[PDB]
Enzyme design. Structure first.
Site, PDB file in Angstrom:
ATOM      1  N   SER A   1     -38.090  -1.399 -58.024  1.00 35.30           N
ATOM      2  CA  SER A   1     -38.540  -2.622 -58.679  1.00 35.30           C
ATOM      3  C   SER A   1     -39.522  -2.264 -59.772  1.00 35.30           C
ATOM      4  O   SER A   1     -40.108  -1.186 -59.745  1.00 35.30           O
ATOM      5  CB  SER A   1     -39.210  -3.572 -57.675  1.00 35.30           C
ATOM      6  OG  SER A   1     -39.782  -4.696 -58.321  1.00 35.30           O
TER       7      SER A   1
ATOM      8  N   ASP B   1     -27.746  -4.914 -40.149  1.00 36.20           N
ATOM      9  CA  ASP B   1     -29.162  -5.123 -40.401  1.00 36.20           C
ATOM     10  C   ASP B   1     -29.702  -3.762 -40.803  1.00 36.20           C
ATOM     11  O   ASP B   1     -29.760  -2.857 -39.970  1.00 36.20           O
ATOM     12  CB  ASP B   1     -29.864  -5.661 -39.153  1.00 36.20           C
ATOM     13  CG  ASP B   1     -31.344  -5.927 -39.367  1.00 36.20           C
ATOM     14  OD1 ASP B   1     -31.946  -6.609 -38.509  1.00 36.20           O
ATOM     15  OD2 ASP B   1     -31.912  -5.458 -40.375  1.00 36.20           O
TER      16      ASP B   1
ATOM     17  N   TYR C   1     -44.770  -6.448 -50.780  1.00 31.89           N
ATOM     18  CA  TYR C   1     -43.550  -6.086 -51.494  1.00 31.89           C
ATOM     19  C   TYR C   1     -43.760  -4.901 -52.427  1.00 31.89           C
ATOM     20  O   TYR C   1     -43.009  -3.925 -52.376  1.00 31.89           O
ATOM     21  CB  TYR C   1     -43.033  -7.287 -52.287  1.00 31.89           C
ATOM     22  CG  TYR C   1     -41.807  -7.003 -53.124  1.00 31.89           C
ATOM     23  CD1 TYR C   1     -41.911  -6.733 -54.483  1.00 31.89           C
ATOM     24  CD2 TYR C   1     -40.541  -7.016 -52.555  1.00 31.89           C
ATOM     25  CE1 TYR C   1     -40.790  -6.480 -55.247  1.00 31.89           C
ATOM     26  CE2 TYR C   1     -39.415  -6.765 -53.310  1.00 31.89           C
ATOM     27  CZ  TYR C   1     -39.544  -6.499 -54.654  1.00 31.89           C
ATOM     28  OH  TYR C   1     -38.426  -6.250 -55.409  1.00 31.89           O
TER      29      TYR C   1
ATOM     30  N   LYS D   1     -42.027  -1.030 -52.443  1.00 31.66           N
ATOM     31  CA  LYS D   1     -41.217  -0.517 -53.540  1.00 31.66           C
ATOM     32  C   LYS D   1     -41.790   0.786 -54.104  1.00 31.66           C
ATOM     33  O   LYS D   1     -41.034   1.672 -54.511  1.00 31.66           O
ATOM     34  CB  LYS D   1     -41.073  -1.580 -54.628  1.00 31.66           C
ATOM     35  CG  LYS D   1     -40.202  -2.754 -54.188  1.00 31.66           C
ATOM     36  CD  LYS D   1     -38.860  -2.269 -53.657  1.00 31.66           C
ATOM     37  CE  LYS D   1     -37.941  -3.431 -53.315  1.00 31.66           C
ATOM     38  NZ  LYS D   1     -36.538  -2.983 -53.033  1.00 31.66           N
TER      39      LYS D   1
HETATM   40  N1  LIG Z   1     -34.497 -10.327 -57.919  1.00 35.53           N
HETATM   41  C1  LIG Z   1     -35.337  -9.615 -58.671  1.00 35.53           C
HETATM   42  O1  LIG Z   1     -35.870 -10.086 -59.662  1.00 35.53           O
HETATM   43  C2  LIG Z   1     -35.639  -8.193 -58.300  1.00 35.53           C
HETATM   44  C3  LIG Z   1     -36.564  -7.477 -59.049  1.00 35.53           C
HETATM   45  C4  LIG Z   1     -36.840  -6.163 -58.704  1.00 35.53           C
HETATM   46  C5  LIG Z   1     -36.179  -5.600 -57.618  1.00 35.53           C
HETATM   47  N2  LIG Z   1     -35.291  -6.310 -56.906  1.00 35.53           N
HETATM   48  C6  LIG Z   1     -34.634  -5.661 -55.769  1.00 35.53           C
HETATM   49  O2  LIG Z   1     -33.210  -5.694 -55.892  1.00 35.53           O
HETATM   50  C7  LIG Z   1     -32.617  -5.794 -54.592  1.00 35.53           C
HETATM   51  C8  LIG Z   1     -31.652  -6.972 -54.569  1.00 35.53           C
HETATM   52  O3  LIG Z   1     -32.398  -8.160 -54.823  1.00 35.53           O
HETATM   53  P1  LIG Z   1     -31.726  -9.612 -55.016  1.00 35.53           P
HETATM   54  O4  LIG Z   1     -32.599 -10.382 -55.979  1.00 35.53           O
HETATM   55  O5  LIG Z   1     -30.233  -9.490 -55.256  1.00 35.53           O
HETATM   56  O6  LIG Z   1     -32.003 -10.189 -53.541  1.00 35.53           O
HETATM   57  P2  LIG Z   1     -31.290 -11.454 -52.855  1.00 35.53           P
HETATM   58  O7  LIG Z   1     -32.296 -12.056 -51.902  1.00 35.53           O
HETATM   59  O8  LIG Z   1     -30.578 -12.327 -53.863  1.00 35.53           O
HETATM   60  O9  LIG Z   1     -30.170 -10.702 -51.987  1.00 35.53           O
HETATM   61  C9  LIG Z   1     -30.556  -9.931 -50.859  1.00 35.53           C
HETATM   62  C10 LIG Z   1     -29.311  -9.583 -50.065  1.00 35.53           C
HETATM   63  O10 LIG Z   1     -29.671  -8.615 -49.076  1.00 35.53           O
HETATM   64  C11 LIG Z   1     -29.292  -9.104 -47.793  1.00 35.53           C
HETATM   65  N3  LIG Z   1     -30.276  -8.676 -46.779  1.00 35.53           N
HETATM   66  C12 LIG Z   1     -31.562  -9.066 -46.668  1.00 35.53           C
HETATM   67  N4  LIG Z   1     -32.154  -8.461 -45.603  1.00 35.53           N
HETATM   68  C13 LIG Z   1     -31.223  -7.673 -45.023  1.00 35.53           C
HETATM   69  C14 LIG Z   1     -31.165  -6.759 -43.862  1.00 35.53           C
HETATM   70  N5  LIG Z   1     -32.258  -6.560 -43.088  1.00 35.53           N
HETATM   71  N6  LIG Z   1     -29.994  -6.128 -43.613  1.00 35.53           N
HETATM   72  C15 LIG Z   1     -28.904  -6.318 -44.380  1.00 35.53           C
HETATM   73  N7  LIG Z   1     -28.878  -7.137 -45.444  1.00 35.53           N
HETATM   74  C16 LIG Z   1     -29.991  -7.825 -45.803  1.00 35.53           C
HETATM   75  C17 LIG Z   1     -29.254 -10.615 -47.918  1.00 35.53           C
HETATM   76  O11 LIG Z   1     -28.372 -11.205 -46.959  1.00 35.53           O
HETATM   77  C18 LIG Z   1     -28.784 -10.814 -49.343  1.00 35.53           C
HETATM   78  O12 LIG Z   1     -27.352 -10.841 -49.403  1.00 35.53           O
HETATM   79  C19 LIG Z   1     -33.760  -5.990 -53.604  1.00 35.53           C
HETATM   80  O13 LIG Z   1     -34.097  -4.737 -53.000  1.00 35.53           O
HETATM   81  C20 LIG Z   1     -34.925  -6.394 -54.470  1.00 35.53           C
HETATM   82  O14 LIG Z   1     -36.156  -5.980 -53.873  1.00 35.53           O
HETATM   83  C21 LIG Z   1     -35.008  -7.582 -57.220  1.00 35.53           C
END
Ligand SMILES: NC(=O)c1ccc[n+]([C@@H]2O[C@H](COP(=O)([O-])OP(=O)(O)OC[C@H]3O[C@@H](n4cnc5c(N)ncnc54)[C@H](O)[C@@H]3O)[C@@H](O)[C@H]2O)c1
Ligand SMILES: NC(=O)c1ccc[n+]([C@@H]2O[C@H](COP(=O)([O-])OP(=O)(O)OC[C@H]3O[C@@H](n4cnc5c(N)ncnc54)[C@H](O)[C@@H]3O)[C@@H](O)[C@H]2O)c1
Ligand SMILES: NC(=O)c1ccc[n+]([C@@H]2O[C@H](COP(=O)([O-])OP(=O)(O)OC[C@H]3O[C@@H](n4cnc5c(N)ncnc54)[C@H](O)[C@@H]3O)[C@@H](O)[C@H]2O)c1
Ligand SMILES: NC(=O)c1ccc[n+]([C@@H]2O[C@H](COP(=O)([O-])OP(=O)(O)OC[C@H]3O[C@@H](n4cnc5c(N)ncnc54)[C@H](O)[C@@H]3O)[C@@H](O)[C@H]2O)c1
Lengths: 239, 255, 255, 239
Positions: free
Chosen positions: D137, D57, D150, D154
């Protein structure tokens, strides 16, 4: 795959050219200095690469178009242009003349308009998208004292990178820029002399630093990135 | 009474700026290439109790800019603020932009600001004090605009100039800041909308509306919006601010 | 008379802001966790002809923030402006920053602004009009500062909040802007300089000077510098500006 | 060479992990979801790569340190950490609670502090510099409506990337970030559902888009770059 690099006779441009060759590009070595351009091209060809020297004054629109088409014909394609050629004017802000401004804007800014236009025409001719890569500067992000004219031209290039990216994206053509910091080249070996009359990583930049970033910007790994001006300055300005 | 010179003050944003600075208590030089509108605005100020002089100047001409500032300094008895506001718009697809287009718009939009800065600095020195330089940038100086590439790049240049000049001139007690209007209903957007209409076939007014859909506050801008900001930039309340380009765009871009 | 609430108004920048807003004609709620200084500043205003009330509030506590705004609205008879100014500094090498450090400084510097925004929006709605929200950011919100990582990150968060809230609240006729002071000689920099001194061994005052060597205008800031900017941000002249974080730093960073 | 990627059980994190494997890294697959983490690690190992799953975590400082050290011991080094794990809260600004803020800041921001600290300790233990790579992000560059909490987290990560880069540069440790746009992952497959109740390149993002940028940020080609947050958003915001 084919790239043209302006100002590639020396310094950052040369380092970029040599890295793109290593990456598998055939490269047009474009410069107003045909002696250095031919020497670099010969070095590449001797080592088993594919290069051609092209003489061009990048402030001359017709010559820029001619250079791109010559590259396209000789090297058998056109996929990347690096608008790298530029000059520095080390003159006090209050001493800057209209003639100074006309010169530095034609060389540092109008050239990039011309390079973009010529590259897009070549991309269309080849029937695919492409990558446009522009030399900005740390001075494009924060204005630099006593390099006032220079700074303003690099800001303009930064702006051009953004607007061109927006306009050309539907064609599958991207436009990004690179922002070097303080690099020990011939340019700073003139800025040094005229100045006479901060880096987090604690060392000055070498041309190969920039070449590594441009390699990424020329690669498929940067396909979804457009309109960005990327600082590789050892940690001077954060953006 | 402190003295301000405003370029492009014959109409639009420049005129609004000039009138607000008069309200703030400045004597104002109304500088414009349009002699008739410059004289008209100056007369309108003088007949309403203010103090103004009209100065005909092409700001792309360095000698004329120096002459305009010197005329303002002599006639109005001082020189404290210059507003480099005069500018033009070009509307043309990126691939169609010509060298002549570039030479023209950089002369009018960028070189003019170099000349204004130089002229004002000389004037401040002759007056024996510091001063304020205020430059018209644009939202297009912060994010490049589609179909207005030449214009956008000139405004980026003005943004950079504002920063560099601020660094260089600070030891003289001279500040340099810029203002970035958004979508303002002036003759310039009348022109932009019309030329965009010719390009994409949308009826007159529709381009203005679509470019304005991004505005958080949900309305286009009026020149008075900009004048309020410039009032601050001309006031002692901005004394410790320099090198900044301030957006008053109703919330289109955040910086 | 319009009504403003200023947090952290017991001293420093907040106090200067409060006094300037009184000068501008606002009735002002002096909000601070320090009850004595809040009462003192309020008394100083009332004895000089203004209208002020002291409100004790810990801005990291959401219920207390709502209570403070409601008390201001009732006692002063309106609510038009909130200035989320209260904040603390931490000074500690990055690798030594603890979870408890983070929980504390984010509660005081960031969550407080969420709560202030929420409370003010509710108040504006009860009053049946729009309003102005003004947040204290920092130069450290624009470029991260060495040895003040926790603090810098909270101010970046406040910068982001200013942008997001501006977008969300614009339809309600509510604007959100921020101010970014530079190096200001307050109790906070007294603290910062002292703690930096303990870390790097430089005599008292020397850290303050070295952090101030970057300033183009060649002098450190005083609270009055910031108050002038906030005056603009509280005035009708900023009505069309939203989502912006404005630097008044003497020219250290340009944005 | 060894990398640890948090949130690597799925989405962007998984794509990053698989690309780093292709690049030649042994990779620690770190996630609170040990099922997906073990599945990804097994996939890598089956294909001839070297991976280990670690349950963590990332809002728990002790667990972050434990994860890094476990990676270091099992995989035989430590060169790169990717602080990727994060959550989205789709809640109206006026409805955001203190409990919401405590949660999202611990998970999205405090985690990056912890990851930086743990990585630096491992770098020192291994006797060399390293690369810290943070997930920001597009919402870190321009605040996004209805994603207020959020967005602010970021922005904080963006700030952290800058300040940490400044502080750690003398150690030969760099800190950069990546800013994805709109990526069709599980995160946006929740944002989609909660929203119910611009891209220049004209297509939504896939996780591999981000992986390509992170490959550069993990490579020697980015050695002289630090403190930067790089947009790979298909041209939504220009920086
Ligand atoms: N998806 C988008 O469009 C987008 C856009 C901008 C930024 N991001 C950033 O990219 C990163 C990845 O995003 P994603 O879309 O792959 O997210 P996702 O929700 O598909 O995957 C998140 C992963 O992180 C793990 N996770 C969540 N909380 C946790 C914790 N406390 N400890 C350990 N693991 C944890 C989850 O189990 C999951 O495997 C994130 O930081 C997100 O903010 C995503
Ligand atoms: N050197 C630095 O520290 C630094 C920092 C930031 C940005 N940059 C930018 O990187 C780019 C390369 O810089 P550099 O240091 O290698 O410069 P350099 O002076 O070493 O090389 C410039 C090259 O461009 C060529 N050139 C100049 N004017 C030309 C024209 N009109 N037409 C065609 N060719 C021309 C020269 O012949 C030379 O080969 C420049 O745009 C510069 O502004 C450099
Ligand atoms: N939406 C907008 O209108 C908008 C948005 C952002 C920035 N701006 C900037 O604000 C400034 C004022 O714009 P506006 O909308 O009031 O324009 P406008 O066209 O209404 O007025 C321009 C004025 O400048 C004068 N002028 C033009 N060229 C000149 C020259 N060479 N020498 C002297 N005077 C000259 C004209 O005669 C005219 O009086 C411009 O710099 C513009 O780029 C405008
Ligand atoms: N150089 C600077 O001083 C500087 C620079 C940039 C930004 N800022 C920002 O400006 C703001 C004011 O700074 P200052 O220098 O006047 O600080 P200061 O320490 O002089 O004053 C802070 C005031 O806030 C009050 N306060 C602290 N925590 C509180 C809480 N939880 N609830 C209610 N009140 C609380 C204090 O009692 C004090 O009156 C701060 O947000 C600071 O981050 C200051």
């Amino acid at each position: 795959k084919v790239a043209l690099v302006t100002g590639a006779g020396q310094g950052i441009g040369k380092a970029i050219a040599l890295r793109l060759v290593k990456d598998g590009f055939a490269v047009a070595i474009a410069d107003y200095n045909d002696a250095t351009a031919k020497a670099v091209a010969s070095e590449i060809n001797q080592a088993g690469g594919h290069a051609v020297a092209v003489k061009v004054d990048v402030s001359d629109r017709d010559q820029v178009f001619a250079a791109v088409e010559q590259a396209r014909k000789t090297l058998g394609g056109f996929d990347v242009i690096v608008n790298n050629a530029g000059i520095a004017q080390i003159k006090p802000l209050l001493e800057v003349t209209e003639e100074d401004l006309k010169q530095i804007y034609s060389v540092n800014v109008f050239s990039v308009f011309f390079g973009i236009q010529a590259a897009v025409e070549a991309f269309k001719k080849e029937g695919h998208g492409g990558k446009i890569i522009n030399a900005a500067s740390i001075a494009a992000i924060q204005g630099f004292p006593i390099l006032s004219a220079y700074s303003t031209t690099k800001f303009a290039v930064r702006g051009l990178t953004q607007t061109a990216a927006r306009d050309l994206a539907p064609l599958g053509i991207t436009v990004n820029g690179y922002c070097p910091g303080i690099v020990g080249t011939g340019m700073w070996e003139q800025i040094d002399a005229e100045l006479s009359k901060s880096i987090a990583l604690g060392r000055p930049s070498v041309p190969e630093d920039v070449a590594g970033l441009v390699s990424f910007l020329a690669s498929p790994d940067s396909d979804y990135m457009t309109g960005q001006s990327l600082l590789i300055d050892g940690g001077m300005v954060f953006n």
